[PDB]
Symmetry: C3
């Protein structure tokens, strides 16, 4: 999967990386993707750049919001996606990301939509097994 993590620049580089490590660990755990199937872009913004409210649920966030956008191939069940959300959020609690400050979106594609390098589509050639 390709994960876009848009967060706040007031978090240290170390915590920033720990967020990335904790997002990956959870995906490996739930999805059971290869350990090295790690593809992440970290973008740190002034808190003014991330506007994230509640959808009228009834809670407020701190300025240190973490948006995690998960780009992954189709096929995962509703319940597996529920486990993703829950596992990401719990991994991020000890590292200083509150449950209220987490927002996750999934966008799907197919296996033939990926090139890991060398101008090759590895799932299509079967060099890389499809999950």
């Amino acid at each position: 999967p390709l994960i876009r993590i848009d967060l706040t620049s007031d978090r240290s580089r170390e915590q920033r990386r720990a967020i990335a490590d904790a997002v990956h660990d959870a995906l490996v755990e739930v999805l059971a993707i290869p350990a090295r199937d790690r593809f992440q872009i970290l973008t740190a913004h002034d808190p003014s750049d991330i506007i994230a409210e509640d959808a009228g649920l009834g809670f407020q966030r701190s300025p240190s919001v973490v948006i995690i956008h998960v780009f992954t191939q189709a096929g995962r069940t509703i319940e597996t996606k529920q486990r993703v959300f829950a596992a990401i959020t719990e991994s991020l609690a000890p590292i200083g990301v509150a449950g209220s400050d987490v927002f996750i979106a999934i966008t799907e594609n197919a296996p033939h939509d990926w090139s890991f390098g060398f101008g090759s589509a590895q799932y299509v050639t079967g060099e890389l097994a499809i999950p």
Copy 2:
């Protein structure tokens, strides 16, 4: 929805925030999403980092391009999306964004692809009503 607003560094931080306000207000008017259903990421670039032409339409854009990428649930009609493009673009005119300088893309997902916080999928559980 989650909105990635990619704009340019010459635009005042004040104007950017107003751009982001107009887009949200446009979405709430047309899509009738909850008023606090606000999830935006602003990325200001050196204008040379954004390259947007006309697809051979026959018009020129200023360097100050504003690309809005809307990530929303499937199910909005063709006609509603047109209404969304139009309303976003009229909102931006009085703020300082010319009609030529707006570009909008929609990418679709499902209600089970969202988490608003706390490790929960709110459209799935019933915490939040599906719009």
Copy 3:
């Protein structure tokens, strides 16, 4: 299509633009999109904020990795996609981007999910021909 290119800050201004040119020429050559159907967002990161391993394929990348995320309407075949992955990489090679350092993902939507400007949906209105 809208392209998001995420690369590292140590690449010069000229190389970023040449990376952006090489990617576009690739899509024109293979997809036969209009020459001016060019919509690219470049974001530069500290090599630390881009994490791209190998998925267990068995290779190493340099810190100077380039992630190209293609947003294009559905309809292109698997083979044309394979051919795009190939084209992009072969074009980036003389520009100083190695095969090992290129990662590509495609995400699709529909013709009616695009506004190229003026609050208008050009594929819908017949103004721009469906490729």
